[PDB]
Each structure stands twice: as C-alpha cells, then as structure tokens.
Design a protein around this ligand. Structure first.
Ligand SMILES: CCCCCCCCCCCCCCCCCC(=O)OC[C@H](COP(=O)([O-])OCC(O)COP(=O)([O-])OC[C@@H](COC(=O)CCCCCCCCCCCCCCCCC)OC(=O)CCCCCCCCCCCCCCCCC)OC(=O)CCCCCCCCCCCCCCCCC
Ligand SMILES: CCCCCCCCCCCCCCCCCC(=O)OC[C@H](COP(=O)([O-])OCC[N+](C)(C)C)OC(=O)CCCCCCCCCCCCCCCCC
Ligand SMILES: CCCCCCCCCCCCCCCCCC(=O)OC[C@H](COP(=O)([O-])OCC[N+](C)(C)C)OC(=O)CCCCCCCCCCCCCCCCC
Ligand code: SF4
Ligand code: SF4
Ligand SMILES: [Zn+2]
Lengths: 52, 49, 95, 45, 209, 115, 176, 52, 96, 115
C-alpha cells in the first residue's frame, strides 16, 4: 500500500487525497516513468497475495 | 565460507567509520553502522551518503 | 539482495517460492528520479480553422426533460430487454 | 520537436501473473503416518 | 458520435424508457401525475404521496419491472414550493438492467407512508430524512435521529438552517463537562456571489411572467 | 383546502391527551435519571424543567404541530431512558454556563447594538 | 464472465481421505503457515532509519505554503484574489491596497493552515506562480497560533525554500 | 473504458464471510489483470476535455 | 527597509506597528515579531530602466511560462517610464 | 427434464423437484385473480398477456434448461418466485384499485424545475 501511495503522490502530489480525477478528465498527465514502475509493482504483487 | 565473508564486512564497517570510537558514535547517534560513499557536505556540518 | 546463499535457500524452502526473482524491496530496476523534459500533445480543438465552438458545445446541446405524460391492443413492455445470462470464465471457471 | 508522453514500451510490457499459485507440497498421507508410527515403536522399545 | 468533446446520445434507451413510462401511467392512473425522460436517458415518475406503497410494490413485484433494489431514498428542500420537500426513490432492476426514479412531495406537517414494507433498506434512509429534513414517515419500526447529536434541535439540511448552526460545544472546567453555547465564529463564513448576470442555457429559459 | 392528512390526533382534545400522557412518563423518569446519570440537581428541579418545556409551547392550537412535538418528546425519552444520552446532554436543558443575558433596554444599550 | 470461488467438491478415494486426515491430525497446513513467517524473518526489513533516512517524494508534493518572488526580489502576487475564491476551505484571507509606487499589492495575506486541505488549487489558480505548496512537511508546532500564517511568514518561507521550490517547478511546469 | 478490458467476476455460493473473503482476494487478482491491459493499451493524446 | 518605532517594534512592509498603548504587543513578550527584511518596494527600484527602440514593448517577467501573463507597454510618453503591472520593471524608449 | 440441479447458486433458494407443475399452478392462479379485476384495467390486460405467454412456454417445452432460456427469467426457481410475487401484487391491486382516476392533481408548480 505504501508503494501505491507513491503512485498517487507522483501524479498528484498527495499520498491519499489526490483530487486528481476531475470533471472532464484528470488534472495532470502521468509523469514520465510512472507506468514502468507500476508494471514492476504489478509483476511482483500476485506473490504477495499468495503469501496472504 | 559465506559466514566468514559476512563477518569481514562487519569489521570493515568499524574501520570505515574511523575505529571503535567513530563506530560507536554513529551507532548511538544514528542506530545504523553502514558505510557509504560521501556525496558531499554542507555548510552546517551535515554529511550526506 | 544482500542475503547469503544459505539464507536464500532457507527462506525459499520455508515459503516454497523463488523469492529472489520477485523481491518486495525495490532496488535499481525503478525509474530514475530525474527524467527528461516532456512535450505533451494538444487536443482535437487546437485548430486554426473549422473550429467554431458552436459546433462543439456540449452544454448547449442539453435539452429539458421530455414530458411523456402529464396531468395538465398494445403489447406489454419492459424497461429494457431482459439481461443476458453470464458465461463461465474459460481462463479458470472454478478457483 | 516530437511529442513525448508516458507511454507503453513499443513491444509492450512483459506478461504479468495474476492467478493463484499455491504449490503442492509434502509427503503422502500414508508416508507421514508410517513415520509417526515408526518413531513411537522405536521410542517404546 | 464523432464529436470528441460531446457526450454521445443513445436514442434506443430513450425510446425504451419512454414507453415504460407510458406503461406505468396506464397501469397506475390513480397516483401518477407526470412521467419524464431526460436527455441523458433517465426515467422519472412523479406521483401523489398516497401511492408510495402501491407504486413501489408494483415496480418491485411486476414481472415487467422487477425493481428489487432500493439504491437510494432522499429528499430535497425547495422552499418556494408550498410542499417544500421532494421525496425521491431511486430503484434498480437487475433483471432488466434499468433504473427508475420515483418522486413525490410533502410538507413540514404532512406524513408520508413508510416504504419499509416494500424495501427493508428504507428503514435507515427514512430515519435520515426525518433527522435531516424533519419529514415524518408513518408506521416506521423505529423513527429516531441517526446522524445528528443526541438532543440536537433542528433539521440541518433544510435550506433555512444556518450552515454553522445555532450552538457550539466546548469543555468547561467549572462544571467538568462538555457544554453547548451559542455559536460565535472568529472568522465569519464569507458568502461569495458567483452567479453571472448573463444567461447561459437558452433551452431552459423560463417563460416571462 | 383546509382538509389535511393528520399525524395521529384528529382534534386538539385527542392531542392534549397525548401531551398529558407524555408529561406522566417524564415525571416518573426524572427520579431515575437523576440517580442513573448521577446528576447534582434535585428531582424537583428536573420536574420543574419538564414543566417549563411543556409551558414554552403553551400557545399552539394546531393538532398536527402538537403531534410532532409529542413525537419529538417521546424520542428524547427513549434516549434518556436507554442512556443513549450522556450527562452533558441531560444538563444542556439547564444552561448552567451561560451567564444571564440582559433583558432590559438600558442593559442592552450599554453592551451592544442588538434589539 | 464469472468464476466460482468456492464450489469444488473433494475426492473420496482412500488416498485423498487419508491425506486430509493427516492434515487434520498432523496439522500440515498450519505448519505451512509457520514457514511463511519464518521466511519473512530472514528477509531484509523494509524499515528506513528516519530521520537520517527520508521517504521518497516527487516534485509535485503539496506541503507548506510559500509566497514567491520574481528574480528582482519583487513579490509575484498582484492581489487578484483567485486563490481566495477557489480555496475549498476558505482558508485564505486577502486585503489589498495601492502601494506607494502604485503597484497592486497585498496588505494582508493570511492562510489558516488548520483550515487548509493542502489541495493545491491555490497554486493552480495563481496566474503568476506566486503561491505554492512547497516541499516541506516538517513544520509541526506546539501551539495552534503558530499555524495561522500571515504574509511575513509566507514570504520568509519562500525566501527559505526558494531554491528547492524553483527547481521542482522547473521539473513539473511542462505538465501544468 | 471498462468494456474494453477483460476480467472475471468472483461469485460466492454459501453467502458467508469466507466466500466474501475469497471474492475480495480474487477481485484483487482481476484488478492486476486489468492493470496489465491498461498499461499496454494506454492511448496517446490529451487528458482533459479540450473545451475550456 | 525595516525601521524601528520609538517603542522598539519593527515596522512591516505594510506599515503595521502597534502603538504605545496597544495591549496586543504582549504577544511578542518572550517571543518575536516576524518581519521579512527584504522589502519588495526597495528591491524593484534598484532594477535599472531598460532602453528599447520601439513605441511598444512586451514583458513576460522572464522564464516564459514561469513568469506572468504577457502584456504590452506603451512608451510614447517621455515624461515617464513604462512600467509593468505585474513585475514592476521599467522601460524607456531610446531616442532614435 | 433431466438430471436435477444440485444447487440454484443463490443462497436461500431451494431447488424445486416439480418445476413445471408449480409454474402451471401459479400462473393459472394469477389468471383467476385477474378475473376479479375490472376488464378495462390495464393491469389485467397486460398481466394476462405476459402470463399467458409464460404459461404457453411451460406447456410447450418439457426440458427445464430449454425452458429457462426461453423464459429469460434466470433459473426456473427464480421464475417461480417471480410468479408468487405477481400473485401477491395482484391480490393487493384489488384493494388499492389503482385503475381509478387520479386522486388529486399536484399544486401549480410542484414539478417545475428550475424554480
Ligand atoms: C542461530 C545462529 C546465530 C549465529 C548467526 C551468525 C551469523 O553471522 O548469521 C548471519 C549471517 C548472515 O546472514 P544474512 O541473512 O545473509 O545477512 C544479510 C547480509 O548477508 C548481511 O549484510 P551486512 O552488510 O549487513 O553484513 C555486515 C554486518 C555483519 O553482521 C554480522 O556479522 C552478524 C554477526 C552475528 C553473530 O554488519 C553488521 O551489522 C554488524 C553489526 C553487529 C550486528 C549484530 C550481531 C549480534 C550477534 C549476537 C551477538 C551475541 C553476543 O548468516 C550467514 O551468513 C549464513 C549462516 C546463517 C546463520 C547460521 C549460522 C551457522
Ligand atoms: C503404534 C502402536 C500403537 C500406538 C499408537 C499411538 C497413536 C498414534 C496415532 C495418533 C495420532 C494423533 C495425532 C496427534 C494428535 C491429534 C491432535 C488433534 O486432534 O488435531 C485435531 C485438531 C482439530 O482440527 P479440525 O480442523 O479437524 O477441527 C474440527 C474437528 N472435527 C472436524 C473432527 C470436528 O487440530 C488441532 O489441534 C489444531 C490446533 C490449533 C493450534 C495449533 C498451533 C500451532 C502448533 C504448531 C506446532 C505443533 C508442534 C508442537 C510440538 C511441541 C514439541 C514439544
Ligand atoms: C531458525 C530455525 C530454522 C530451522 C527451522 C526448522 C523448520 C521449521 C518448520 C518449517 C516449516 C516448513 C513448512 C513445511 O514444509 O510444511 C509443508 C507441508 C504442507 O502440507 P499441506 O497441508 O500443504 O499438504 C500436503 C500434505 N498432504 C499431501 C498430506 C496433503 O507440511 C508438511 O507436510 C510437514 C508435516 C510435518 C508435521 C509436523 C507436526 C508433527 C509434530 C510432532 C512433534 C515434533
Ligand atoms: S491548498 Fe487548497 S485548501 Fe490549502 S490554501 Fe490552497 S486552495 Fe486552500
Ligand atoms: S492567486 Fe496568486 S497573485 Fe492572485 S492573490 Fe492569490 S497569490 Fe496573489
Ligand atoms: Zn512584467
């Protein structure tokens, strides 16, 4: 969860209350390199679920 | 064999901090005894690793 | 990553999974924290001709609600066609 | 200059696992019981 | 539907929902007062407040409806209307993948009949309406405040209730308890007048008086 | 036009029956409330306050309004009896901290601009 | 599409029945769970040595408010009051008057940081990049009054944090 | 764009707290399934409606 | 610049100071009155006037999108210097 | 029919060993109830039309799984429950009498929005 707050904070600047999704779309574009890091989180997340 | 290497790394930390006196200073001030590359220093005395 | 080979085996055996391939601590595979400057695209309305707002004004295309009835042998109907039964997943029907 | 936007790699990202993987483990039920019975007999003796 | 910025229109739903409105009005003339379908395709049935149970039961149980889920039940305060309170029922039909809104009205003193017999979800929703707007639902299992403080006097969501209320709380050491006192604000709420003097939407222009 | 759905009472005589019944329940309940909440007031003080609240509205003549006031009272009874309330809520009727406010022209004049 | 999470029936052959019995009597599955906790024991902890180590942040981070300057040293703020109008919390209070040189400048610029929700709307609304939510998050106080910021406080924060603030804007102004 | 992503809906059978646990845990897996598709089919263009 | 009152309190760039008989200066007893020492009115005046060769000049404040909205300043009056309404910079037309 | 289902899949809903017979009994019951309703009422004319459709499909198709597909009401046990609900509604309509004209027209501007 801490790592996913880092994805909120990188798009919006807030770990929780981003206020990112607004009527008409979103406030700012994804910063470069974010999707690569989201892929890394997703690649290793199923294992964390299995441990649970 | 791996254990012996690990123990060497634990003693090189003591020398890398300037000896036992330096090693203990950081242990009690910082609760960490890792040794890192000095990126720089500021005008107030803080060191960055 | 700094774990000795014995410890890697011990925790791999106990867990039962190759934990060193999918470590939960990020190392050097993350993106750089300083990135090249972007250059973002422009919208469909960034045009110098044939771009009158009266042709792309959604707010002004909204109309007041239609009044179907007001106090002021048909076949029966449903609010919408009956819903379609779902199909079992072919990826993994049963967990 | 050309547009630069956070976009997927040209070939696409590698496959991402999502299904459950609880590996099967251990010895058979018969074998585990036999070992326990064997330890008792040796200890009793 | 090639205009990038404009919401697409779905006429198939508009024709479908409009017909079902005629269907309800024909079947329940005694209570239905108006049926309207919006530009973004949502059907609203407006009824006399004495048909809440008949209309809701028909929608729940009729085989060409089957609105088994009460998604929400709320109220709106419109002071200018002599019946200031508009009671709104939003229902979901899983069988037909459709939603319908039912509207009725009441005033400060006139009760509405509780819908708990039709949907057991309405118990708490009706309690909230009473607490927040002061509308009484007759024959309710247990009608009592749900969101406001114990002993709170007033109905906050009415348009005539001040935003910051009439009383505020603090702890007093003399009596060694939390006490309520009239509200005084170090910084008064600043009312901003934002409406523009120029009309924006001609299609909704109200006929001149 | 004047024909209106009732709440419970069809006339003021039937409503005033419910007011009196409610006063009975409150009058029985003050002795327990003082004991249970461990208040530092007397039973007479609490029963006086109940009388004051019932007196405030002594002017109404609409059966429907009286029904609502009775409904609201009965709710406050369920709260107090069941100890949903707390000592702070019960003691808010007595306004102990609020220092007396002036109620004569000269006193209002010396302090502020209010009527 | 849908899948069934728990609609499997067991096998009633003797080997399967015996295996389940062993699981019941020898607590195999419970022992399995003990292994996972044992594996985690020999993993490196995720803890950081705060305050000597800090958690990562981005240039977009919304922190302590500051009032900025042009390179000349002149205040960027022109008292337009757009920040005051957009603030969802009514946390900003502004009074303005003509300066002795005729400039449109503020006499009051107060932010109640106990009303702020740190949403950044006031730095979006500003047309001159004057009010910014800076990087700092370590400004906790021993009293409430210390969190009611006036113009002098916000200007000192700008002069205190300008070097970091400007660099972060340089990184993100193309996304804005 | 939930109609352009493929995912399976977990369904219970006994209506108990255990089935709801399994639905939520399996819903986490499907979200990873959706995230993989969103990462690879992310389109270029603007991010807020071009109507100022 | 920061000038001090007869009581000793520092005056702000808005001219605010507590007069001798005001009780509100007790809040500074044992603490401080925070005043920014860089007065923007004094620093802008230090900037030299720019000599340009046109009747009209544009100012964005510097930095492009990091400055202020672009405006155009008329320099046809020789009894004054064109000033920007945003950044306070002054311009003058250079006699051709 | 075929092999009986082990489960409907819905909690609290039990498999019916005699689906066709139960449906025929219920749909026929509904038509009897609708007889008491006045003829011109639209509830009678519509409820008859759909119910007689459903009744015809039960008699035509012996197999349950084919019947479920044609009825488009989910599992046959879901359909049976819906029949019971309509029967309950039909009996209530007789007392409500919603085919009668509107009780009262709303105030002048009750449904006007914006105000
Ligand atoms: C039960 C058996 C207990 C004996 C364990 C001895 C041991 O060295 O195990 C750790 C050692 C390292 O295991 P690891 O999980 O890979 O450590 C992570 C990195 O390798 C380690 O990377 P690193 O860079 O951190 O290594 C350098 C590290 C060096 O740390 C050490 O040298 C560990 C010393 C432990 C003794 O530097 C330090 O932090 C030394 C500071 C002092 C640490 C506190 C040690 C207290 C021990 C108890 C004192 C009793 C009096 O174990 C092995 O190498 C394999 C053997 C596993 C233990 C079985 C021993 C037979
Ligand atoms: C050979 C010559 C003749 C002599 C033969 C002697 C008999 C030998 C065969 C007997 C088999 C006995 C098996 C062991 C006892 C079974 C216990 C039992 O009843 O389990 C059922 C119980 C119940 O399991 P359950 O899930 O089936 O419960 C429901 C039971 N039914 C369905 C039947 C109604 O299991 C447990 O006890 C769970 C305990 C939970 C707490 C576990 C904590 C973790 C402990 C892990 C470490 C354990 C190792 C400790 C070692 C200590 C070292 C000092
Ligand atoms: C520092 C210390 C480091 C060294 C620690 C020693 C190892 C500690 C335990 C590690 C746990 C490993 C988990 C594991 O392998 O179990 C997997 C497996 C998982 O089993 P399962 O439940 O998943 O299913 C497989 C079994 N069948 C086929 C029957 C269904 O568990 C076992 O088989 C181990 C059985 C051991 C039983 C022990 C209880 C009896 C105790 C008697 C008193 C002694
Ligand atoms: S960050 Fe948001 S809440 Fe805080 S002062 Fe700015 S606009 Fe107001
Ligand atoms: S929006 Fe910017 S320039 Fe306008 S009043 Fe606020 S801080 Fe000053
Ligand atoms: Zn300028």
């Amino acid at each position: 969860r801490e790592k996913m707050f880092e994805f909120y904070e990188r798009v919006s600047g807030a770990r929780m209350h981003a206020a990112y999704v607004r009527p008409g779309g979103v406030h700012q574009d994804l910063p470069l390199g974010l999707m690569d890091d989201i892929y890394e989180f997703s690649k290793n997340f199923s294992l964390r679920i299995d441990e649970l | 064999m791996e254990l012996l290497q690990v123990l060497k790394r634990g003693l090189q930390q003591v020398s890398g901090h300037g000896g036992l006196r330096g090693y203990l200073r950081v242990l009690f001030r910082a609760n960490d005894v890792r040794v890192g590359t000095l990126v720089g220093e500021d005008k107030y005395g803080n060191k960055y690793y | 990553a700094s774990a000795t080979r014995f410890i890697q085996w011990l925790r791999n055996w106990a867990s039962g999974r190759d934990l060193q391939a999918k470590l939960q601590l990020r190392y050097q595979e993350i993106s750089k924290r300083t990135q090249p400057p972007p250059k973002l695209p422009v919208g469909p309305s960034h045009k110098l001709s044939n771009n009158y707002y009266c042709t792309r004004d959604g707010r002004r295309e909204a109309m007041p609600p239609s009044i179907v009835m007001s106090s002021q042998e048909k076949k029966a109907v449903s609010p919408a066609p009956p819903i379609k039964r779902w199909e079992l997943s072919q990826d993994e029907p049963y967990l | 200059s050309k547009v630069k936007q956070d976009m997927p790699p040209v070939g696409g990202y590698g496959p991402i696992d999502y299904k459950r993987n609880l590996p099967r483990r251990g010895l058979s039920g018969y074998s585990m019981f036999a070992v326990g019975i064997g330890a008792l007999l040796f200890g009793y003796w | 539907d090639t205009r990038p910025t404009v919401r697409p229109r779905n006429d198939v739903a508009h024709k479908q929902l409009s017909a079902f409105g005629e269907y309800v009005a024909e079947i329940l003339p005694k209570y239905v007062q108006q049926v309207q379908v919006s530009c973004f395709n949502e059907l609203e049935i407006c009824i006399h407040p004495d048909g809440v149970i008949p209309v809701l039961t028909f929608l729940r149980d009729h085989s060409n409806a089957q609105f088994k889920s009460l998604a929400d039940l709320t109220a709106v305060d419109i002071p200018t209307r002599q019946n200031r309170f508009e009671i709104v029922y939003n229902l979901l039909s899983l069988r037909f993948n459709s939603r319908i809104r039912v509207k009725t009205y009441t005033d400060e003193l006139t009760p509405i009949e509780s819908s708990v017999p039709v949907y057991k979800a309405a118990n708490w929703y009706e309690r909230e309406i009473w607490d927040m707007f002061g509308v009484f639902f007759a024959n309710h299992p247990d009608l009592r405040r749900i969101l406001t403080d114990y002993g709170f006097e007033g109905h906050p969501f009415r348009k005539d209730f001040p935003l910051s209320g009439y009383v505020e709380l603090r702890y007093d050491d003399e009596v060694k308890r939390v006490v309520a006192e009239p509200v005084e604000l170090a910084q008064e709420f600043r009312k901003f007048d934002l409406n523009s003097p120029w009309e924006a939407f001609p299609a909704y222009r109200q006929p001149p008086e | 036009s004047t024909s209106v759905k009732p709440i419970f009472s069809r006339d003021m005589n039937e409503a005033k029956r419910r007011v009196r019944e409610l006063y009975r329940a409150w009058y029985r309940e003050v002795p327990n409330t003082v004991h249970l909440f461990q208040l530092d007031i007397s039973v007479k003080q609490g029963r006086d306050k109940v009388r004051e609240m019932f007196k405030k509205n002594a002017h109404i003549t609409d059966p429907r309004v009286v029904d609502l006031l009775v409904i609201k009272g009965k709710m406050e009874l369920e709260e107090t009896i069941k100890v949903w309330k707390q000592r702070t809520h019960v003691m808010r009727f007595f306004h102990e901290t609020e220092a007396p406010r002036p109620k004569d022209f000269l006193s209002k004049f010396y302090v502020g601009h209010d009527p | 599409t849908y899948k069934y999470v728990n609609l499997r029936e067991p096998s009633m052959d003797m080997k399967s029945v015996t295996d389940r019995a062993a699981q019941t009597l020898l607590w195999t599955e419970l022992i399995r769970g003990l292994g996972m906790t044992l594996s985690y024991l020999f993993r490196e902890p995720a803890t950081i040595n705060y305050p000597f180590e800090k958690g990562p942040l981005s240039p977009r981070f919304r922190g302590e408010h500051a009032l900025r300057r042009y390179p000349s040293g002149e205040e960027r703020c022109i008292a337009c009051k757009l920040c005051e109008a957009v603030c969802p919390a009514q946390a900003i209070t502004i009074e303005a008057e003509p300066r002795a040189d005729g400039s449109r400048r503020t006499t009051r610029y107060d932010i109640d940081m106990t009303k702020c929700i740190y949403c950044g709307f006031c730095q979006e609304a500003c047309p001159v990049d004057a009010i910014v939510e800076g990087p700092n998050f370590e400004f906790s106080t021993e009293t409430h009054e210390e969190l009611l910021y006036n113009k002098e406080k916000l200007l000192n924060n700008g002069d205190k944090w300008e070097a970091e603030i400007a660099a972060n804007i340089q990184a993100d102004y193309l996304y804005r | 764009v939930y109609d352009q992503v493929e995912f399976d809906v977990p369904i219970g059978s006994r209506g108990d707290c255990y089935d709801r646990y399994l639905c939520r845990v399996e819903e986490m897996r499907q979200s990873i399934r959706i995230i993989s598709q969103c990462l690879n089919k992310m389109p270029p263009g603007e991010i807020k409606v071009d109507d100022a | 610049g920061v000038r001090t009152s007869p009581t000793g309190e520092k005056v702000t760039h808005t001219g605010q100071v507590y007069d001798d008989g005001d009780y509100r200066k007790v809040r500074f007893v044992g603490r401080q009155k925070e005043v920014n020492e860089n007065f923007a009115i004094d620093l802008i005046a230090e900037q030299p006037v720019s000599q340009v060769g046109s009747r009209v000049i544009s100012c964005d404040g510097g930095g492009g999108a990091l400055g202020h909205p672009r405006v155009y300043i008329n320099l046809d009056k020789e009894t004054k210097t064109g000033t920007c309404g945003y950044c306070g910079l002054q311009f003058r037309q250079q006699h051709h | 029919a075929g092999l009986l289902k082990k489960t409907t899949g819905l909690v609290g809903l039990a498999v019916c060993e005699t689906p066709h017979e139960r449906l025929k009994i219920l749909y026929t019951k509904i038509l009897d109830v609708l007889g008491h309703i006045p003829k011109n009422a639209a509830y009678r004319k519509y409820t008859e039309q759909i119910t007689n459709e459903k009744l015809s499909m039960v008699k035509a198709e012996p197999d349950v799984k084919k019947l479920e597909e044609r009825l488009q009401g989910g599992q046959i046990e879901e359909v049976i429950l819906q029949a019971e609900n309509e029967l309950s509604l039909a009996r209530k309509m007789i007392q409500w009498k919603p085919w009668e004209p509107l009780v009262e027209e709303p105030p002048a501007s009750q449904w006007k929005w914006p105000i």
